[PDB]
């Protein structure tokens, strides 16, 4: 549970764009913990000495209950307002697990979205997460 930081003091995070298939047309979002009627891209803090790709896959399993085939690093995205820096990877989902950690613990929800709908629901409070899909 120990948070880690870059040398500028930004929190180190990792996340995946969890796609339903190699066509990358539908992505899995999860509910916000603060505001459960909102959607976010699953992700979270890198542990000490943890590789970003390992952190990304681990947080997706914890938060979204999925596993799959890790793909490319999309990019490294800074949130200046919230002082964090996130490595974002593609993950092609191959396993959808029931009763996952955040479902059991906080009633976290998950849902598939077409890319243009994911961008729409992320824009108001997670505009940097909406920018993950730009490329
Ligand atoms: O609970 P999570 O994992 O979904 O994500 C929370 C961040 O957790 P994050 O996803 O970065 O980490 P993890 O708990 O490892 O997933 C947390 O970050 P932190 O303050 O470091 O706890 C941040 O708190 P902030 O400090 O006010 O920015 C919250 O806003 C954010 O909540 P959300 O985006 O509404 O779901
Ligand atoms: Cl898809
Ligand atoms: Cl963000
Ligand atoms: F977490
Ligand atoms: Mg988490
Ligand atoms: Mg998180
Ligand atoms: Mg975490």
Author numbering: 8 to 142
What's written in the study?
We have biochemically and structurally characterized a minimalist inositol phosphate kinase (i.e., TvIPK) encoded by Terrestrivirus, a nucleocytoplasmic large (“giant”) DNA virus (NCLDV). We show that TvIPK can synthesize inositol pyrophosphates from a range of scyllo- and myo-IPs, both in vitro and when expressed in yeast cells. We find a heart-shaped ligand binding pocket comprising an array of positively charged and flexible side chains, underlying the observed substrate diversity. A crucial arginine residue in a conserved “G-loop” orients the γ-phosphate of ATP to allow substrate pyrophosphorylation.
To determine structures of TvIPK products, these were purified and soaked into crystals of human DIPP1; this experiment does not exclude the possibility that a substrate yields multiple products, only one of which is captured in DIPP1 crystal complexes. We suggest that minor conformational changes are also required to rotate the plane of the inositol ring by 60° to establish catalytic productivity for two substrate configurations that we have captured in our TvIPK crystal complexes: those for scyllo-IP5 and scyllo-IP6. This proposal is consistent with our demonstration that TvIPK pyrophosphorylates the 3-phosphate of scyllo-IP5. In any case, these data provide further validation that TvIPK selectively adds a β-phosphate to pre-existing phosphate, and thus exclusively synthesizes PP-IPs.
